Amino acid sequence: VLSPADKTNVKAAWGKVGAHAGEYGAEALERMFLSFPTTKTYFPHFDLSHGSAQVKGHGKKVADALTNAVAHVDDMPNALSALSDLHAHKLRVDPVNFKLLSHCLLVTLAAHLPAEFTPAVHASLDKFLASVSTVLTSKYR
Amino acid sequence: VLSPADKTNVKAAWGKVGAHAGEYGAEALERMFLSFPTTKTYFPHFDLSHGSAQVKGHGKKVADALTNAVAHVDDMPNALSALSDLHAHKLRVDPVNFKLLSHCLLVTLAAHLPAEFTPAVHASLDKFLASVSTVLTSKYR
Amino acid sequence: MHLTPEEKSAVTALWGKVNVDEVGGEALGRLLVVYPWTQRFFESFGDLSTPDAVMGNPKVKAHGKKVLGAFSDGLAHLDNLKGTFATLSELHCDKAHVDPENFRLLGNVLVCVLAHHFGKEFTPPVQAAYQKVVAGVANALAHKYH
Amino acid sequence: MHLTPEEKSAVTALWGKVNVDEVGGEALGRLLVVYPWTQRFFESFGDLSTPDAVMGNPKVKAHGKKVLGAFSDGLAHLDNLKGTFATLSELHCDKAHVDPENFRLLGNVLVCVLAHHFGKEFTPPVQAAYQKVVAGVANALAHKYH
Ligand code: HEM
Ligand code: HEM
Ligand code: HEM
Ligand code: HEM
């Protein structure tokens, strides 16, 4: 569970992301594609080339969803319901892949927010991403 | 989330275990130790030899807790508070290991309750062990 | 593999008693039921709405036999699973887009099916050798992903 | 360990800029802070109650430097990690009783630490090289477990 401090941490770090969320989302994707090539099996229909607009497009959608979960940090299960449904019923992404993206998102933020990416914040951001992942996977079976 | 069908399936299956839960607990540990030897890192103080009273005794303990979980299938978080605590603050077993014991437990029930280990029952027990695992690792951080 | 002559013999000997037809259909069917998300690759098979519909589906049972067959033949090249599954590894990546995690889910299901079937015979030491094989198989199959 | 020549040059060029003393303390401290369960091995280190207490603990800093020290040497024998890490693998297993999952957690934390430090220089492709390396090392450290 996310503590008040966690919540503060996350709103703070994400706050700094501001307008770059879109780009950091795309970047987290590319990092993931490169480090964990098995994740690519879910995007057989995408152009995964560097600077792919599909990836740009998708990076933004992921970022918006994360931004929406931060805005509703006290009611995530409800804020993300629709997305929880899509993932469980249509996409059916194996659960292990959430951890991989989470990881690539943490690397991206670390690479962009040196001042804010403190140990305390790192811990908070990791618990947050784990919670988002949990919600998204909650209706799988 | 355990459906009502699941709760039913679980209680029935566990119902058949009966006076053998202790032996099945001991057998699941033994299978865990041999198949996933990294799990042994948590029991340096035990004699992990076959038929060891330490293993037998521990097997009973685990079995009993499961019993108690099936019985309070509706209120696991509460029925296992103490156990959640112990694991989060004392034992500190890495979360990956829970999946390993869960698997050795299925294997054990399957080998012992053939008639009862139907595909639907298999699905329920799995979800159940998963929920138990989630409860036991919920206070980790 | 990193199988002990004794481990090799245990595997080999139990397998001799296996009906691939039946074990293959049951392993794939259980997979689709326990881990419903694996059904994403088998929409063309039909109605997988229930355990019953999954377990009875002939398309499932037949794909299951094809899978265990290939598996069964891999047991004869236990010292080079990599080379035995190379073309199958490419296929899975490049044609089927199957996430290798699926190979591990099945492996574990397979082990539960064997225990189910053999009861007593499927002892801790025998399961241990099987766990090494399924892991070995999954790794070989995932080897050519890029 | 499928390090292409270019993946290896990339690992090596970046590692040239690292202050192992410093990175070692940061990576270990951060592990104890993000995954507090890992604190189970260090109850003789004293106060690990808060982030500052962990990060600044002279004992954590000293142990980190040691760990990263052995890791750097590993980086000069990329060809033979298993050989390089053999006595250490035995020690972690037999004496310290450290679950190998701990080695993967630290690798990921380390990757985040490198990203933290190098910013834009830690490009997608450099991360991918380092991902293979941390995994190779965790695998080598777990090879003697039994
Ligand atoms: C916290 C993690 C995640 C978030 C916030 C997220 C969010 C989203 C969103 C907002 C969409 C677009 C749905 C729409 O069309 O409106 C989407 C689609 C999709 N996601 Fe997830 N997702 C996550 C994890 C994953 C992972 C780990 C994978 C697989 C590696 C994945 C695979 C997909 C796929 C294949 C699509 C469909 C894309 C398309 O065809 O345009 N997702 N996700
Ligand atoms: C299905 C999930 C599990 C349940 C229900 C469970 C239950 C228990 C119980 C009832 C105890 C004994 C409490 C006491 O001594 O009063 C215990 C202790 C312990 N458990 Fe857990 N356990 C589970 C998973 C695990 C796993 C996966 C591991 C490690 C691989 C583990 C490691 C330990 C250890 C090391 C002890 C203490 C042993 C001793 O010194 O006697 N547990 N657990
Ligand atoms: C023991 C591991 C496995 C083995 C040995 C294996 C083997 C095979 C073989 C021999 C084929 C035949 C295709 C051909 O030659 O054209 C096949 C096809 C296929 N497999 Fe695998 N498989 C394994 C695991 C899986 C899993 C776990 C899944 C998904 C849950 C999967 C999904 C598929 C699909 C979707 C096809 C396509 C068949 C078609 O053309 O309709 N496989 N596999
Ligand atoms: C890259 C991975 C690692 C490397 C290269 C490494 C290296 C080392 C070295 C060189 C030593 C001292 C050897 C000796 O005392 O003779 C050591 C000790 C130890 N390591 Fe590891 N280590 C690694 C990861 C870890 C992790 C992730 C943990 C725990 C979460 C850990 C737990 C320990 C412990 C508890 C000791 C004994 C410390 C003492 O009391 O002196 N190690 N390690």
PDB file of N, CA and C in Angstrom, chain A residues 37-42 44 88 90-97 140-141, chain C residues 34-37 39-40 43 92-93 97-102 105 145-146:
ATOM      1  N   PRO A  37      13.577  -8.078 -25.536  1.00  0.00           N
ATOM      2  CA  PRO A  37      13.047  -8.300 -26.882  1.00  0.00           C
ATOM      3  C   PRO A  37      11.808  -9.163 -26.944  1.00  0.00           C
ATOM      4  N   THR A  38      11.601  -9.951 -25.909  1.00  0.00           N
ATOM      5  CA  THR A  38      10.432 -10.810 -25.827  1.00  0.00           C
ATOM      6  C   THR A  38       9.174  -9.967 -25.730  1.00  0.00           C
ATOM      7  N   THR A  39       9.247  -8.742 -25.272  1.00  0.00           N
ATOM      8  CA  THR A  39       8.071  -7.842 -25.112  1.00  0.00           C
ATOM      9  C   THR A  39       7.509  -7.416 -26.454  1.00  0.00           C
ATOM     10  N   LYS A  40       8.344  -7.547 -27.461  1.00  0.00           N
ATOM     11  CA  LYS A  40       8.039  -7.213 -28.848  1.00  0.00           C
ATOM     12  C   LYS A  40       6.955  -8.084 -29.447  1.00  0.00           C
ATOM     13  N   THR A  41       6.794  -9.277 -28.913  1.00  0.00           N
ATOM     14  CA  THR A  41       5.763 -10.210 -29.403  1.00  0.00           C
ATOM     15  C   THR A  41       4.364  -9.638 -29.274  1.00  0.00           C
ATOM     16  N   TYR A  42       4.172  -8.607 -28.463  1.00  0.00           N
ATOM     17  CA  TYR A  42       2.853  -7.987 -28.282  1.00  0.00           C
ATOM     18  C   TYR A  42       2.610  -6.870 -29.272  1.00  0.00           C
ATOM     19  N   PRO A  44       3.373  -6.924 -32.795  1.00  0.00           N
ATOM     20  CA  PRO A  44       3.763  -7.445 -34.133  1.00  0.00           C
ATOM     21  C   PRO A  44       3.354  -6.514 -35.248  1.00  0.00           C
ATOM     22  N   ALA A  88      -7.008  -7.390 -19.443  1.00  0.00           N
ATOM     23  CA  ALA A  88      -7.455  -8.718 -19.051  1.00  0.00           C
ATOM     24  C   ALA A  88      -8.175  -9.474 -20.165  1.00  0.00           C
ATOM     25  N   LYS A  90      -8.741  -8.281 -23.792  1.00  0.00           N
ATOM     26  CA  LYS A  90      -8.339  -8.168 -25.205  1.00  0.00           C
ATOM     27  C   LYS A  90      -6.855  -8.399 -25.373  1.00  0.00           C
ATOM     28  N   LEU A  91      -6.040  -7.502 -24.820  1.00  0.00           N
ATOM     29  CA  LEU A  91      -4.585  -7.613 -24.970  1.00  0.00           C
ATOM     30  C   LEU A  91      -4.030  -8.872 -24.339  1.00  0.00           C
ATOM     31  N   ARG A  92      -4.509  -9.217 -23.158  1.00  0.00           N
ATOM     32  CA  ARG A  92      -4.020 -10.398 -22.447  1.00  0.00           C
ATOM     33  C   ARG A  92      -2.509 -10.518 -22.372  1.00  0.00           C
ATOM     34  N   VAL A  93      -1.817  -9.422 -22.052  1.00  0.00           N
ATOM     35  CA  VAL A  93      -0.362  -9.363 -21.859  1.00  0.00           C
ATOM     36  C   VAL A  93      -0.023 -10.238 -20.645  1.00  0.00           C
ATOM     37  N   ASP A  94       0.974 -11.108 -20.764  1.00  0.00           N
ATOM     38  CA  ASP A  94       1.345 -11.932 -19.606  1.00  0.00           C
ATOM     39  C   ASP A  94       1.841 -10.945 -18.515  1.00  0.00           C
ATOM     40  N   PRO A  95       1.410 -11.231 -17.308  1.00  0.00           N
ATOM     41  CA  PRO A  95       1.749 -10.410 -16.161  1.00  0.00           C
ATOM     42  C   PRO A  95       3.204 -10.067 -15.959  1.00  0.00           C
ATOM     43  N   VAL A  96       4.130 -10.957 -16.326  1.00  0.00           N
ATOM     44  CA  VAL A  96       5.537 -10.708 -16.098  1.00  0.00           C
ATOM     45  C   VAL A  96       6.021  -9.475 -16.865  1.00  0.00           C
ATOM     46  N   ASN A  97       5.328  -9.124 -17.943  1.00  0.00           N
ATOM     47  CA  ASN A  97       5.824  -7.990 -18.720  1.00  0.00           C
ATOM     48  C   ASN A  97       5.634  -6.630 -18.049  1.00  0.00           C
ATOM     49  N   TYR A 140      -7.549 -10.596 -14.602  1.00  0.00           N
ATOM     50  CA  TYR A 140      -7.013 -11.624 -15.500  1.00  0.00           C
ATOM     51  C   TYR A 140      -7.671 -12.994 -15.356  1.00  0.00           C
ATOM     52  N   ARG A 141      -8.012 -13.381 -14.155  1.00  0.00           N
ATOM     53  CA  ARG A 141      -8.710 -14.639 -13.876  1.00  0.00           C
ATOM     54  C   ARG A 141      -9.497 -14.543 -12.573  1.00  0.00           C
TER      55      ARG A 141
ATOM     56  N   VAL C  34      -6.365 -22.557 -16.471  1.00  0.00           N
ATOM     57  CA  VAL C  34      -5.685 -22.012 -15.298  1.00  0.00           C
ATOM     58  C   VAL C  34      -5.205 -20.580 -15.540  1.00  0.00           C
ATOM     59  N   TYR C  35      -4.598 -20.348 -16.676  1.00  0.00           N
ATOM     60  CA  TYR C  35      -4.080 -19.107 -17.170  1.00  0.00           C
ATOM     61  C   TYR C  35      -4.828 -18.682 -18.424  1.00  0.00           C
ATOM     62  N   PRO C  36      -6.038 -18.245 -18.185  1.00  0.00           N
ATOM     63  CA  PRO C  36      -6.931 -17.862 -19.275  1.00  0.00           C
ATOM     64  C   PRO C  36      -6.336 -16.971 -20.328  1.00  0.00           C
ATOM     65  N   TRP C  37      -5.344 -16.149 -19.994  1.00  0.00           N
ATOM     66  CA  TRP C  37      -4.778 -15.216 -20.963  1.00  0.00           C
ATOM     67  C   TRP C  37      -4.023 -15.895 -22.094  1.00  0.00           C
ATOM     68  N   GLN C  39      -5.178 -17.986 -23.960  1.00  0.00           N
ATOM     69  CA  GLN C  39      -6.165 -18.263 -25.017  1.00  0.00           C
ATOM     70  C   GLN C  39      -6.062 -17.269 -26.148  1.00  0.00           C
ATOM     71  N   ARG C  40      -5.323 -16.200 -25.915  1.00  0.00           N
ATOM     72  CA  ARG C  40      -5.149 -15.144 -26.912  1.00  0.00           C
ATOM     73  C   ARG C  40      -4.615 -15.688 -28.226  1.00  0.00           C
ATOM     74  N   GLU C  43      -7.980 -18.279 -30.799  1.00  0.00           N
ATOM     75  CA  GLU C  43      -9.334 -17.740 -30.973  1.00  0.00           C
ATOM     76  C   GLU C  43     -10.076 -18.536 -32.045  1.00  0.00           C
ATOM     77  N   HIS C  92       8.283 -19.582 -33.546  1.00  0.00           N
ATOM     78  CA  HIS C  92       7.511 -19.075 -32.406  1.00  0.00           C
ATOM     79  C   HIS C  92       7.632 -17.565 -32.233  1.00  0.00           C
ATOM     80  N   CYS C  93       8.813 -17.063 -32.537  1.00  0.00           N
ATOM     81  CA  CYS C  93       9.158 -15.657 -32.448  1.00  0.00           C
ATOM     82  C   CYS C  93       8.571 -14.888 -33.626  1.00  0.00           C
ATOM     83  N   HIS C  97       4.617 -15.177 -32.708  1.00  0.00           N
ATOM     84  CA  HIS C  97       4.671 -14.076 -31.705  1.00  0.00           C
ATOM     85  C   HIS C  97       4.238 -14.595 -30.345  1.00  0.00           C
ATOM     86  N   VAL C  98       4.784 -15.730 -29.916  1.00  0.00           N
ATOM     87  CA  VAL C  98       4.398 -16.298 -28.614  1.00  0.00           C
ATOM     88  C   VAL C  98       5.412 -15.818 -27.576  1.00  0.00           C
ATOM     89  N   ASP C  99       4.929 -15.220 -26.522  1.00  0.00           N
ATOM     90  CA  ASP C  99       5.913 -14.741 -25.469  1.00  0.00           C
ATOM     91  C   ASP C  99       6.459 -15.993 -24.815  1.00  0.00           C
ATOM     92  N   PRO C 100       7.788 -16.123 -24.708  1.00  0.00           N
ATOM     93  CA  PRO C 100       8.412 -17.293 -24.101  1.00  0.00           C
ATOM     94  C   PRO C 100       7.910 -17.620 -22.729  1.00  0.00           C
ATOM     95  N   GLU C 101       7.283 -16.682 -22.030  1.00  0.00           N
ATOM     96  CA  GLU C 101       6.795 -16.970 -20.670  1.00  0.00           C
ATOM     97  C   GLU C 101       5.790 -18.105 -20.659  1.00  0.00           C
ATOM     98  N   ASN C 102       5.066 -18.216 -21.755  1.00  0.00           N
ATOM     99  CA  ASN C 102       4.073 -19.250 -22.051  1.00  0.00           C
ATOM    100  C   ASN C 102       4.689 -20.653 -21.991  1.00  0.00           C
ATOM    101  N   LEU C 105       4.888 -21.503 -18.404  1.00  0.00           N
ATOM    102  CA  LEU C 105       3.566 -21.809 -17.818  1.00  0.00           C
ATOM    103  C   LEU C 105       3.219 -23.266 -18.155  1.00  0.00           C
ATOM    104  N   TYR C 145      14.820 -15.878 -30.009  1.00  0.00           N
ATOM    105  CA  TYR C 145      14.030 -14.635 -29.968  1.00  0.00           C
ATOM    106  C   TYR C 145      14.997 -13.449 -30.060  1.00  0.00           C
ATOM    107  N   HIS C 146      14.526 -12.455 -30.774  1.00  0.00           N
ATOM    108  CA  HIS C 146      15.316 -11.238 -31.016  1.00  0.00           C
ATOM    109  C   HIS C 146      14.334 -10.099 -31.329  1.00  0.00           C
TER     110      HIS C 146
END
